[PDB]
PDB file of C-alpha atoms and ligand atoms in Angstrom:
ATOM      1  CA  UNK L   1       0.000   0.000   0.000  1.00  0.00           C
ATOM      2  CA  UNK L   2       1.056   3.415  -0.102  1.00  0.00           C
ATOM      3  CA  UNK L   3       1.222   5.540   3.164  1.00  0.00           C
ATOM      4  CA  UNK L   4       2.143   9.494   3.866  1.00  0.00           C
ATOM      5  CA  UNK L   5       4.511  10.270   6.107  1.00  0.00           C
ATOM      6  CA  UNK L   6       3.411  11.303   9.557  1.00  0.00           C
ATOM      7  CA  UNK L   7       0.075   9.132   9.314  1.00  0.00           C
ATOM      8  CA  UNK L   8      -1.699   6.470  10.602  1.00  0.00           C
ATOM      9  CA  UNK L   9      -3.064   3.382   8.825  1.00  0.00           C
ATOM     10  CA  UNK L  10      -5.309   0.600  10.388  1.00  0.00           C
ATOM     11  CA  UNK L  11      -3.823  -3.007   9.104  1.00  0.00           C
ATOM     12  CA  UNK L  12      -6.844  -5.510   8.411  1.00  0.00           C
ATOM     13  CA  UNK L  13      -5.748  -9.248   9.498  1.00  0.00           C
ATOM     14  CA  UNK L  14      -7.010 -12.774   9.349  1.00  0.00           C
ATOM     15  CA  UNK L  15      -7.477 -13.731  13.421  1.00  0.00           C
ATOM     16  CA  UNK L  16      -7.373 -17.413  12.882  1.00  0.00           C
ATOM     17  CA  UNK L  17      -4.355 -19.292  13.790  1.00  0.00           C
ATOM     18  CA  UNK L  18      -2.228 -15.637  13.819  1.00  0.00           C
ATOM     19  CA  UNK L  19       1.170 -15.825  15.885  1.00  0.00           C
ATOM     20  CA  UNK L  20       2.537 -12.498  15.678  1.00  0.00           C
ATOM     21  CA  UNK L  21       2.667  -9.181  13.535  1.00  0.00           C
ATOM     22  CA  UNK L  22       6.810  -8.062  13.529  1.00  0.00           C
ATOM     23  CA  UNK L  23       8.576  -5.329  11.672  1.00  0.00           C
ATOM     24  CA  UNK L  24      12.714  -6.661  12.180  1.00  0.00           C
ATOM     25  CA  UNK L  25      12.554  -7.528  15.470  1.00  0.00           C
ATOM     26  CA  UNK L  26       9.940  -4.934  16.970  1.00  0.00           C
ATOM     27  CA  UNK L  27       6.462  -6.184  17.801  1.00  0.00           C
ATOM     28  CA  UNK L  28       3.633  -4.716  17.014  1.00  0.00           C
ATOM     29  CA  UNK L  29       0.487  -5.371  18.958  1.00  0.00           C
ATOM     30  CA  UNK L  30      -3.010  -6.251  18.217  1.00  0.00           C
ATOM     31  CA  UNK L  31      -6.531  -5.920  18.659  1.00  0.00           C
ATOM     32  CA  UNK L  32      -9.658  -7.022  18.216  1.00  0.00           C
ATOM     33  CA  UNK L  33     -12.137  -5.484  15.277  1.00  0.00           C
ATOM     34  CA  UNK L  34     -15.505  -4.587  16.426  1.00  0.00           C
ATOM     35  CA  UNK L  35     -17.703  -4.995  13.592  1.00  0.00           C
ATOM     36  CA  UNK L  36     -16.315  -8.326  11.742  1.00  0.00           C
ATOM     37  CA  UNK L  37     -15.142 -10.888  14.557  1.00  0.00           C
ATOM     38  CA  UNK L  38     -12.419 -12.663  11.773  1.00  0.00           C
ATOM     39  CA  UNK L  39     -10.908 -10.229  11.612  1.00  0.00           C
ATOM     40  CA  UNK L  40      -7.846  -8.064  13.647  1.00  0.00           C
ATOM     41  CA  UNK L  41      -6.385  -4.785  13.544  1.00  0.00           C
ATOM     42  CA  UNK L  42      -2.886  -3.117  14.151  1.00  0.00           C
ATOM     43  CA  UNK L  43      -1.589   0.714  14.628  1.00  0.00           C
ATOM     44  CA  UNK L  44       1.127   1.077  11.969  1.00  0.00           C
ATOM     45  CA  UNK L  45       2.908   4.809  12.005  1.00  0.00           C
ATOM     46  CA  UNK L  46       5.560   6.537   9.720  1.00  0.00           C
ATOM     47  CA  UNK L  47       7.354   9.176  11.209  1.00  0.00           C
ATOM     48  CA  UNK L  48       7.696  12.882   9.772  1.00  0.00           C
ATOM     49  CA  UNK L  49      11.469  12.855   9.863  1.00  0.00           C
ATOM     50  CA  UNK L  50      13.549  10.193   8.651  1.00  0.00           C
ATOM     51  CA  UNK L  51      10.698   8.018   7.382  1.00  0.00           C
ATOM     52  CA  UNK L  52      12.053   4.864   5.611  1.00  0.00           C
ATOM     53  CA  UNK L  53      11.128   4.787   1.713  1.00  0.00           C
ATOM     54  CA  UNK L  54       9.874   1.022   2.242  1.00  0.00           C
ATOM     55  CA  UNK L  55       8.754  -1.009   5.009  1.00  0.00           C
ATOM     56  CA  UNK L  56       8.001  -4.680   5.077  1.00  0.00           C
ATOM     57  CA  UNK L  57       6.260  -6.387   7.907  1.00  0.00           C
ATOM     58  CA  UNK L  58       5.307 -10.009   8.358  1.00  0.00           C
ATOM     59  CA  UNK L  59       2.060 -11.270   9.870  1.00  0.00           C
ATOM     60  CA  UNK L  60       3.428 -14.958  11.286  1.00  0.00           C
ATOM     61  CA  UNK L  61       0.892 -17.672  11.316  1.00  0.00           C
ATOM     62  CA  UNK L  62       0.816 -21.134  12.456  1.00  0.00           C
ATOM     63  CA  UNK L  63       0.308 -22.209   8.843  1.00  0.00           C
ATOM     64  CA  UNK L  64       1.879 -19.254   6.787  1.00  0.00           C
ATOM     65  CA  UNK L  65       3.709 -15.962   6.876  1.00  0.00           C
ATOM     66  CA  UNK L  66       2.444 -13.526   4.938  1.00  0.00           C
ATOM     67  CA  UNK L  67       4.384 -10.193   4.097  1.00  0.00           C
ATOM     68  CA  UNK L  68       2.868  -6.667   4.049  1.00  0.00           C
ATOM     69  CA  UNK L  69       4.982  -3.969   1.900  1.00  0.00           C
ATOM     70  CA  UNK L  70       4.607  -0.236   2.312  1.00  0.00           C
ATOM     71  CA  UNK L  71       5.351   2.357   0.282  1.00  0.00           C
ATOM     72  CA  UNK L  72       6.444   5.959   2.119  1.00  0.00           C
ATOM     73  CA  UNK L  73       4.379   9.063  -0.055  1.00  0.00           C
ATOM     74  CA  UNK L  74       5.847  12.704   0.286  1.00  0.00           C
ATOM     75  CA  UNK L  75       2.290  13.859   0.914  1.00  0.00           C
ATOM     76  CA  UNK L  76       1.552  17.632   0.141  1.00  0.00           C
ATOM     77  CA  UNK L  77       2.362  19.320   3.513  1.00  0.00           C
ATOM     78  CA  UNK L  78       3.535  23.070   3.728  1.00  0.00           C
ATOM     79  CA  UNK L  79       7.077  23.936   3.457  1.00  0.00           C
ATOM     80  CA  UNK L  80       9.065  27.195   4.385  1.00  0.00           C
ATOM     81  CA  UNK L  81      13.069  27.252   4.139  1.00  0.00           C
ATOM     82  CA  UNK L  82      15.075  28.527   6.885  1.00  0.00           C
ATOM     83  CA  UNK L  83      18.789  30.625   6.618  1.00  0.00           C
ATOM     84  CA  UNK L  84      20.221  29.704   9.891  1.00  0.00           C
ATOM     85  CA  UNK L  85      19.514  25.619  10.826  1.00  0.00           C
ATOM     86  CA  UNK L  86      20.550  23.963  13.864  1.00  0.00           C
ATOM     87  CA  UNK L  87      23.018  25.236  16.606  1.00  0.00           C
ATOM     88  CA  UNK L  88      22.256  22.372  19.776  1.00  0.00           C
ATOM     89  CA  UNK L  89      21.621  26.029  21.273  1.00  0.00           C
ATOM     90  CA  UNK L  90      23.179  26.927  24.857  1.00  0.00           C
ATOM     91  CA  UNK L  91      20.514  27.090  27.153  1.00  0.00           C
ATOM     92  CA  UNK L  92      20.933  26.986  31.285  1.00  0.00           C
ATOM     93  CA  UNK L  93      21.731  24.046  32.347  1.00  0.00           C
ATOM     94  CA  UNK L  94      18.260  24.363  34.959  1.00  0.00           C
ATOM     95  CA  UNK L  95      16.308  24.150  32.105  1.00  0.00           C
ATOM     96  CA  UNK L  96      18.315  21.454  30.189  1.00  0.00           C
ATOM     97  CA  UNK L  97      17.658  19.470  33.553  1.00  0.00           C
ATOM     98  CA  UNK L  98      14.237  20.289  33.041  1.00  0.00           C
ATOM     99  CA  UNK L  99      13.556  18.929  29.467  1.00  0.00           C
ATOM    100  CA  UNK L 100      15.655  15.857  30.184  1.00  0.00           C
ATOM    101  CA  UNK L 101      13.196  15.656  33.298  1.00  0.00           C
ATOM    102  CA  UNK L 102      10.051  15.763  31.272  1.00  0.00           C
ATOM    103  CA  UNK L 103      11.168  13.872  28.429  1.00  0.00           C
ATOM    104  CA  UNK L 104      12.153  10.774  30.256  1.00  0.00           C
ATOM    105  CA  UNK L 105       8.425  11.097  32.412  1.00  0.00           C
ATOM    106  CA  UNK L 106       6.793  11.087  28.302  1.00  0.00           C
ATOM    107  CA  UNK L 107       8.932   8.221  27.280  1.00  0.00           C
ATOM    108  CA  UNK L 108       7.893   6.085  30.203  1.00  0.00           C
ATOM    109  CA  UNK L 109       4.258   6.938  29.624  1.00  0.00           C
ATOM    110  CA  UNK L 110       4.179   6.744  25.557  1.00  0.00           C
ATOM    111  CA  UNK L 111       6.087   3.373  26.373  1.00  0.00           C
ATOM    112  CA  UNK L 112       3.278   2.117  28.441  1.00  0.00           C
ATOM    113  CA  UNK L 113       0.738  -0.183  26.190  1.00  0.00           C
ATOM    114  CA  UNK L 114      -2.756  -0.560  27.704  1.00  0.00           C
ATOM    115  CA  UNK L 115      -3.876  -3.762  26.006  1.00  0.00           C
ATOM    116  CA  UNK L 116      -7.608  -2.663  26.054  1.00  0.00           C
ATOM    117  CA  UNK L 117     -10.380  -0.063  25.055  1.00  0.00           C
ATOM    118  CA  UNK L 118     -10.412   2.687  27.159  1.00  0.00           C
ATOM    119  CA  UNK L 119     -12.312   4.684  24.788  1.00  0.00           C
ATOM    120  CA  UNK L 120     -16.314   4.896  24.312  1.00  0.00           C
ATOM    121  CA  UNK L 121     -17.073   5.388  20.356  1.00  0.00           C
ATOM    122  CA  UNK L 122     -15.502   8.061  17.946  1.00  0.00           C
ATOM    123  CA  UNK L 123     -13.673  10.685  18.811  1.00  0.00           C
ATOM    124  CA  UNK L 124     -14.984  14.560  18.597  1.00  0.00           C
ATOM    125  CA  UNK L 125     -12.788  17.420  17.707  1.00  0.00           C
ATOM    126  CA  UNK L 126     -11.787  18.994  21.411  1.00  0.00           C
ATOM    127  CA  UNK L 127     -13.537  22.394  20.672  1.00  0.00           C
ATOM    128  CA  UNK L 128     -15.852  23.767  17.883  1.00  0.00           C
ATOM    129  CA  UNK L 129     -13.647  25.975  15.834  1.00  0.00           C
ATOM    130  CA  UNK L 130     -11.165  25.715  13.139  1.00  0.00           C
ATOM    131  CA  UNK L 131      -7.849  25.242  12.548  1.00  0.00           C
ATOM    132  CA  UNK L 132      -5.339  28.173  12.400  1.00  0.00           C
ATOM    133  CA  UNK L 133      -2.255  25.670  11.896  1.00  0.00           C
ATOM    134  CA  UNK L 134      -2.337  22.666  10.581  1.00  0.00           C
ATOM    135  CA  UNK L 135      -0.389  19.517  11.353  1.00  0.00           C
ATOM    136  CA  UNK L 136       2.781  18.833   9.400  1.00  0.00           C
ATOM    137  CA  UNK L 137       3.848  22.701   8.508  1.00  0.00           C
ATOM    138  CA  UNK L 138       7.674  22.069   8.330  1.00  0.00           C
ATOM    139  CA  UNK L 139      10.825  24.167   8.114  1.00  0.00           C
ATOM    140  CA  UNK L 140      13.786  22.782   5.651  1.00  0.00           C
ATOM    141  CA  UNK L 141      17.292  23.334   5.207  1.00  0.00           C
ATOM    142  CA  UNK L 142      19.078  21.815   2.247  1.00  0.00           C
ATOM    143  CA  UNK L 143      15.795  20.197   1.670  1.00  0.00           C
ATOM    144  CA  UNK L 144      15.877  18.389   4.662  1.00  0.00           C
ATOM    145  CA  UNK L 145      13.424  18.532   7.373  1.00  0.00           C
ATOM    146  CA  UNK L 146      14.977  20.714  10.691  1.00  0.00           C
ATOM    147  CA  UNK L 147      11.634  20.486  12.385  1.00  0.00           C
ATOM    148  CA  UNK L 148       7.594  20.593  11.724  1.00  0.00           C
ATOM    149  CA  UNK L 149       4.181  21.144  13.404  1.00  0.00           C
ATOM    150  CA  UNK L 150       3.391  18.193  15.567  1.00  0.00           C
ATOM    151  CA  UNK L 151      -0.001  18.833  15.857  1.00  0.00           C
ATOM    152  CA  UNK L 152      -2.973  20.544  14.729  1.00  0.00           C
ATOM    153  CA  UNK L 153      -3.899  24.479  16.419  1.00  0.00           C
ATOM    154  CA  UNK L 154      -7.440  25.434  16.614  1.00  0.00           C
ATOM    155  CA  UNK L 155      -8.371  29.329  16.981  1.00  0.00           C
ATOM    156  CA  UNK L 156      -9.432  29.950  20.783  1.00  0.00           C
ATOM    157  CA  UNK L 157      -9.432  33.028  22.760  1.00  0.00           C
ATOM    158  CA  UNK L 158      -7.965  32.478  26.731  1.00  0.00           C
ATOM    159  CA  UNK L 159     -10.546  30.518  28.985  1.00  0.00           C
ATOM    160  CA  UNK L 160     -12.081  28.605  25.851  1.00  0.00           C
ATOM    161  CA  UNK L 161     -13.509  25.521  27.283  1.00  0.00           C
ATOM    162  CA  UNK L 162     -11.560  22.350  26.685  1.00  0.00           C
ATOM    163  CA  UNK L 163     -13.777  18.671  25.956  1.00  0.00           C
ATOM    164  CA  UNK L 164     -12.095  15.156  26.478  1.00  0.00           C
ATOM    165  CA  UNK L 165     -11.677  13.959  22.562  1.00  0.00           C
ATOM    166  CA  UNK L 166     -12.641  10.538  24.053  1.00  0.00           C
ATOM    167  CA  UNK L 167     -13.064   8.516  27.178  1.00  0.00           C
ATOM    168  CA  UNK L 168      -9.583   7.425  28.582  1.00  0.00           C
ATOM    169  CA  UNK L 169      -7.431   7.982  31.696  1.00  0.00           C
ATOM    170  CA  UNK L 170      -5.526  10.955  32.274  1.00  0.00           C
ATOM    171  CA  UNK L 171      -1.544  10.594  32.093  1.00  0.00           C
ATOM    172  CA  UNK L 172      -0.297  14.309  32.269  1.00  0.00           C
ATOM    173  CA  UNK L 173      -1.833  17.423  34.018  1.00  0.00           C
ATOM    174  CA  UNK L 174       1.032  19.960  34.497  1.00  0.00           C
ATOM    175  CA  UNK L 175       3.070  22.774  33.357  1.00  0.00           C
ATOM    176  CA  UNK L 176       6.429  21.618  31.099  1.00  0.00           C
ATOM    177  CA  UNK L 177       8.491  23.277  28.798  1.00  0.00           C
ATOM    178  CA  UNK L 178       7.617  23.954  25.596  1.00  0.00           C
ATOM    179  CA  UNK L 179       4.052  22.336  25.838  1.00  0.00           C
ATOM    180  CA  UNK L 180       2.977  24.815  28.590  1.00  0.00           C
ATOM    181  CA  UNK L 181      -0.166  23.435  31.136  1.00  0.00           C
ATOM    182  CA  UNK L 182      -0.590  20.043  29.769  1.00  0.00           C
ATOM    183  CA  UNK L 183      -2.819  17.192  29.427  1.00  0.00           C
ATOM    184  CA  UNK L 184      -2.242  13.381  27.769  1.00  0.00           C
ATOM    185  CA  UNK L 185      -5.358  10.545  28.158  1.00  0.00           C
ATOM    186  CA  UNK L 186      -4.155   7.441  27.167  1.00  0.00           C
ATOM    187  CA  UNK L 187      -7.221   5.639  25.685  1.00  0.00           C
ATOM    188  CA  UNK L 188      -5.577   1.814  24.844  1.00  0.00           C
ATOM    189  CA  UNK L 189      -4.046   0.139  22.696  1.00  0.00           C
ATOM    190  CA  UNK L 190      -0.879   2.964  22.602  1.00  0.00           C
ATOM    191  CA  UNK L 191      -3.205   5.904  21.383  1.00  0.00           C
ATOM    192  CA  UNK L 192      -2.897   8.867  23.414  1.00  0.00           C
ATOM    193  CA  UNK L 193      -4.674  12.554  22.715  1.00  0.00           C
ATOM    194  CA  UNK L 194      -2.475  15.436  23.975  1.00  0.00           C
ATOM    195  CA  UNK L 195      -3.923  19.358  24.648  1.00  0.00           C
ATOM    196  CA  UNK L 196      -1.224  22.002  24.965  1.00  0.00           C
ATOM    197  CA  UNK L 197      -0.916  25.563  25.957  1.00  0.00           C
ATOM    198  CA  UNK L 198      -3.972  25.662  28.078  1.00  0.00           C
ATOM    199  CA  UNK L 199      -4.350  28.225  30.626  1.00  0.00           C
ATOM    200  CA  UNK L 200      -5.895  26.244  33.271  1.00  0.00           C
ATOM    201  CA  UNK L 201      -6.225  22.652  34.213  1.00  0.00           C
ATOM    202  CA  UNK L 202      -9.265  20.968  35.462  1.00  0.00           C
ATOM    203  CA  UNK L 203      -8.036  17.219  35.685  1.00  0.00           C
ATOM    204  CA  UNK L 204      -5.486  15.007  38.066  1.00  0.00           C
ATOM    205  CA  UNK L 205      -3.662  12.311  37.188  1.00  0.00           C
ATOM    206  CA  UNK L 206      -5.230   8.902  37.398  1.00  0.00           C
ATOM    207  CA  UNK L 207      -8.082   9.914  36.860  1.00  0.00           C
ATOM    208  CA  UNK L 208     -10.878   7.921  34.891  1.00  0.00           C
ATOM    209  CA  UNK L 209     -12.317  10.502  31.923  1.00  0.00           C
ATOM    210  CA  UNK L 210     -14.951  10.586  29.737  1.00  0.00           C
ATOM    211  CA  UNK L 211     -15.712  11.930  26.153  1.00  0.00           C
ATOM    212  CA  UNK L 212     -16.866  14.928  25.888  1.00  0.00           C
ATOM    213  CA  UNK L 213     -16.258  16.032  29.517  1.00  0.00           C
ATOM    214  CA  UNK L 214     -14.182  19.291  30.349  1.00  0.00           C
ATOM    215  CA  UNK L 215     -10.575  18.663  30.600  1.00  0.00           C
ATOM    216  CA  UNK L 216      -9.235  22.324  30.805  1.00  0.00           C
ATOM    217  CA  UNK L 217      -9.494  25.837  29.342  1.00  0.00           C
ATOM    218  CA  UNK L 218      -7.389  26.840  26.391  1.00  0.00           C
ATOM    219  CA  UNK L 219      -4.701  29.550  26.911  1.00  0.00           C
ATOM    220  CA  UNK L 220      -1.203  30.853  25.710  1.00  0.00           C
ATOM    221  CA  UNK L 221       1.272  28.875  28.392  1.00  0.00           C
ATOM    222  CA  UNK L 222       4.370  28.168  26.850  1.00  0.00           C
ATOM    223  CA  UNK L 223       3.515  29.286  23.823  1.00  0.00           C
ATOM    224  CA  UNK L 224       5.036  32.217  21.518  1.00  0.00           C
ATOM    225  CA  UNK L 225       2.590  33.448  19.159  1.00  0.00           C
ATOM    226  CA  UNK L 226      -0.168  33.832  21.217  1.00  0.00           C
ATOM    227  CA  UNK L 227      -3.503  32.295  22.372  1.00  0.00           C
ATOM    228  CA  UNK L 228      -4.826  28.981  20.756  1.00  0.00           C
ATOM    229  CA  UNK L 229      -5.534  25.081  21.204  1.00  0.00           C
ATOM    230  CA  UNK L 230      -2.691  22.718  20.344  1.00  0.00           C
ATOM    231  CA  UNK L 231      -4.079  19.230  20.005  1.00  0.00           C
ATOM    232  CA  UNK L 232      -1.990  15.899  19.385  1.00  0.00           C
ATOM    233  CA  UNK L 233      -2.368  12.157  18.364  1.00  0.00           C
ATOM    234  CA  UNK L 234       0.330   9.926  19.365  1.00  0.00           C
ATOM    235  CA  UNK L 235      -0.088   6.365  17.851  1.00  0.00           C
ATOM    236  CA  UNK L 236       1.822   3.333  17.037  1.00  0.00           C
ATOM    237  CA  UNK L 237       4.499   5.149  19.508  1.00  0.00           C
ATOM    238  CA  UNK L 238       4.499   8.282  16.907  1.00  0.00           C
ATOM    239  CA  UNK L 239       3.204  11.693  16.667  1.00  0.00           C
ATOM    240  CA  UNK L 240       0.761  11.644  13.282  1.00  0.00           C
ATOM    241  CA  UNK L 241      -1.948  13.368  11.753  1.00  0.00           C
ATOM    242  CA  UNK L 242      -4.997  14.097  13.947  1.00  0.00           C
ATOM    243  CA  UNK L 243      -7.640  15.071  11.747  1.00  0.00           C
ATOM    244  CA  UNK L 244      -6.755  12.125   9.496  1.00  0.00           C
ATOM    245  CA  UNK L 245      -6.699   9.804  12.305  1.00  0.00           C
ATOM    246  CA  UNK L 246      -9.876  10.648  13.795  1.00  0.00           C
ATOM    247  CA  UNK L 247     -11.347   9.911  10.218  1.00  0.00           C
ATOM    248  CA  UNK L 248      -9.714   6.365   9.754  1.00  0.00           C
ATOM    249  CA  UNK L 249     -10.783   5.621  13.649  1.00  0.00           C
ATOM    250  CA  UNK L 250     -14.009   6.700  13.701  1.00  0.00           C
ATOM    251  CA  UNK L 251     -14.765   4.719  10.214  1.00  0.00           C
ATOM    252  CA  UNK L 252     -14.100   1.503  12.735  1.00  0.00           C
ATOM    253  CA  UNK L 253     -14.718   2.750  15.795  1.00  0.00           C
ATOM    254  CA  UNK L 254     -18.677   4.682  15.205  1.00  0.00           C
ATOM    255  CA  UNK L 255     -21.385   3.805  17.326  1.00  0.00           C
TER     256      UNK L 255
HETATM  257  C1  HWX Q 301       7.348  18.273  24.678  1.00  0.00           C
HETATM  258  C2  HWX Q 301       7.365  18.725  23.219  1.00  0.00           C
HETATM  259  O1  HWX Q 301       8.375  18.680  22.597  1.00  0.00           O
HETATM  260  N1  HWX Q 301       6.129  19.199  22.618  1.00  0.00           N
HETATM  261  C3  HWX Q 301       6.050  19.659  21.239  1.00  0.00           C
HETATM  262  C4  HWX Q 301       5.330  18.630  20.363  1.00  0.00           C
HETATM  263  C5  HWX Q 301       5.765  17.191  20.666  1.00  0.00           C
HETATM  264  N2  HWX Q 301       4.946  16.638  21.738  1.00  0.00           N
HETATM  265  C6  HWX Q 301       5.533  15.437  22.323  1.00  0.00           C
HETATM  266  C7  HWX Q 301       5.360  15.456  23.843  1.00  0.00           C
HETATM  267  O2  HWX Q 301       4.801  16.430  24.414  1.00  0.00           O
HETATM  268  O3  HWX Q 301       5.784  14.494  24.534  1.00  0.00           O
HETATM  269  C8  HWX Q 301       5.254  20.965  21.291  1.00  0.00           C
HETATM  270  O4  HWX Q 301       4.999  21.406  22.364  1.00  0.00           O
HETATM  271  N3  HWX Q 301       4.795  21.684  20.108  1.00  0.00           N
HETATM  272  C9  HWX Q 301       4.025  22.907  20.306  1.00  0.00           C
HETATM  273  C10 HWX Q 301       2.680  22.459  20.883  1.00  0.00           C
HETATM  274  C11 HWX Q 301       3.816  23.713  19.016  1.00  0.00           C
HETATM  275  O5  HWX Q 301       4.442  23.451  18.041  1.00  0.00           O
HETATM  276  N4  HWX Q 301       2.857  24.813  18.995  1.00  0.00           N
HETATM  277  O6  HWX Q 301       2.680  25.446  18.019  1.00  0.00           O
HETATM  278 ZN1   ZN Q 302       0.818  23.992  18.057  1.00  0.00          ZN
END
């Protein structure tokens, strides 16, 4: 098949006598599909930078293997150049300590696979507005990519309510750097919804959440230019589109 780069795609298998689903050595989980009950699915993401051109992986059964090949599409995201690149800039070591900090708490949780539903249904968009930055908007140098947009930014003025996507359990509720007052639900199965720059949080970790259900109010924390929403998917242990996710989910997923 052919797949863009920083997407999700929803692999269809035969659940009869299946072993394992491996790409090299890494595992890839599974789960059940809700509608046909033959049938199993599996989170498969390409990264933004650095995506492979071609990926095999191999679905091992007791009776067969049987090889999946897919091919990595450029996709037609937004580009700007830059005159300046990379310096590993020289920031104070107190805040170097804090990244490191922060990064290793994400790891662990990203890292953490909740072999079940947590979710109830489709997902709905966080807020009813519309986006102001979309997802993938990258910055080259020698036509390679230096950095891009993670996520997708909705338009909302300070103290805009803030809904749960989708039922889950809440991971993150603090202030970091660079993502300002955060929030991460895991919902199963490694998919985990992620709302930035808020000005005020309204959930603890732990705690059980439900769709639909305030979560926070938007805001401008740790963020440059100004107030807005910054909203995430992370799936098959990578960042990818949100708006294109939702779609593909919710096609399995409705109620
Ligand atoms: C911690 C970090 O690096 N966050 C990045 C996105 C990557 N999230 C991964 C994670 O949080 O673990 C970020 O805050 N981008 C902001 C929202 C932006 O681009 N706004 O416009
Ligand atoms: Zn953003």
């Amino acid at each position: 098949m052919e797949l863009i780069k920083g997407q999700a795609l929803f692999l269809e298998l035969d659940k009869k006598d299946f072993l394992s689903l491996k790409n090299n050595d890494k595992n890839i989980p599974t789960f059940a599909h809700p509608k046909n009950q033959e049938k199993i699915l599996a989170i498969f993401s390409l990264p933004y930078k650095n995506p492979p051109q071609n990926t095999k992986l191999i679905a091992f059964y007791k009776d067969k293997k049987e090889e999946i090949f897919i091919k990595t599409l450029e996709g037609n995201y937004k580009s700007e150049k830059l005159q300046v690149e990379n310096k590993k800039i020289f920031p104070p070591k107190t805040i170097q300590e804090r990244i490191a900090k922060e990064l290793k708490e994400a790891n662990a949780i990203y890292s953490s696979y909740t072999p079940k539903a947590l979710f109830n249904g489709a997902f709905n968009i966080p807020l009813n507005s519309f986006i102001t930055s979309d997802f993938g908007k990258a910055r080259t140098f020698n036509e390679k990519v230096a950095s891009y947009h993670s996520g997708t930014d909705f338009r909302a003025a300070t103290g805009t309510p803030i809904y749960a996507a989708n039922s889950g359990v809440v991971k993150i509720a603090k202030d970091r750097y660079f993502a300002g007052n955060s929030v991460v639900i895991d919902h199963g199965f490694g998919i985990y919804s992620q709302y930035y720059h808020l000005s005020k949080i309204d959930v603890k970790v732990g705690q059980k959440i439900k769709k639909g259900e305030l979560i926070g109010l938007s805001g401008a924390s740790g963020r440059v230019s100004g107030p807005a929403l910054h909203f995430g998917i992370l799936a098959g242990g990578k960042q990818v589109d949100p708006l294109d996710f939702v779609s593909k989910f919710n096609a399995i997923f409705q109620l």
